[PDB]
């Protein structure tokens, strides 16, 4: 794509890259384990749009945060289970987790991490029985990101197109 980017485009790329990112991370994980696995390869799957430059973004992010994720993933679900959030306070809780994480600051590593645990927390409720949490989580993420000045940060770092300019690029 082209250089530069505004919060407007950042939001769209965020949701897209978010779904694709979590999709890849969990995709490769399905081989090793099945923790918080998706709804099987079907219509309920995560039909991402890898045809765009964003497609490569999620993949890369999953790599730089692959070991890190799985590393603190086992424990992530452990404590997450002790939470047991709801669809009413879903955002009330999520917003807290992120705010507490990015509280120290904002960095490429923090962004990827947010999504890593994001999908987990989402599926946690979805599989629990609250069918239809994917959209809720995604919406809260994009809204929280564009509210926590996150979008602006990403745009300054070179939008989501900067992922290819990272470690494994």
């Amino acid at each position: 794509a082209l250089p530069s980017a505004s919060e407007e485009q950042v939001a769209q790329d965020t949701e897209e890259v978010f779904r694709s990112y979590v999709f890849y991370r969990h995709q490769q994980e399905q081989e090793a384990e099945g923790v918080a696995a998706p709804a099987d390869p079907e219509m309920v799957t995560l039909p991402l749009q890898p045809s765009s430059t964003m497609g490569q973004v999620g993949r890369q992010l999953a790599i730089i945060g692959d070991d890190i994720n799985r590393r603190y993933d086992s424990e992530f679900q452990t404590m997450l289970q002790h939470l047991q959030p709801t669809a009413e306070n879903a955002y009330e809780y999520f917003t807290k987790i992120a705010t507490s994480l990015f509280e120290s600051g904002i960095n490429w590593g923090r962004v990827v991490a947010l999504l890593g645990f994001g999908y987990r927390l989402a599926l946690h409720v979805y599989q629990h029985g609250l069918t239809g949490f994917l959209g809720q989580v995604t919406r809260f993420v994009v809204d929280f990101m564009l509210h926590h000045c996150i979008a602006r940060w990403i745009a300054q770092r070179g939008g989501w197109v900067a992922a290819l300019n990272l470690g494994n690029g």
Partner: peptide, 22 residues
């Protein structure tokens, strides 16, 4: 309660270390 601070204190650990491993 203990989870409210724990769930946040546990993420002391996913934000940083990737940025340095990239």
């Amino acid at each position: 309660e203990d989870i409210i601070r724990n769930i946040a204190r546990h993420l002391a650990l996913v934000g940083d270390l990737l940025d340095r491993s990239i």
